Amino acid sequence: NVIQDLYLRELKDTKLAPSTLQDAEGNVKPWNPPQKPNLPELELQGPEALKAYTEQNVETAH
Amino acid sequence: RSVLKNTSVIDKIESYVKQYKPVKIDASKQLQVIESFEKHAMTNAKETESLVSKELKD
User: What's the length of chain B?
Assistant: 58
Pick the closest to residue A47 from B9, B37, B51 (CA basis).
B37
Structure's resolution in angstroms: 3.8
Q: Which residues in chain B have their CB less than 8 angstroms from residue A21's CB?
A: 6, 8
Alpha carbon distances (Å) from A32 to A21, A37, B17, B48? 18, 15, 11, 57
Min Cα separation B30/chain A (Å) = 8
How many helices (H) and strands (E) would you count in chain A?
A: 3, 0
Q: Report the run of H or E that residue A8 belongs to, with start and end.
A: helix A2-13
Distance CA B52, CA B56 (A): 6
> For A33, what's the count of Cα atoms within 13 Å in the CB-facing half-sphere?
8
Distance CA A37, CA A40 (A): 9
- Solved using: cryo-EM
Distance CA A46, CA B58 (A): 37
In this complex, the residue of B6, B9, B23 whose CB is nearest that of residue A34 is: B23
Asked if the C-beta of A26 comes within 8 angstroms of chain B's C-beta atoms, the answer is no
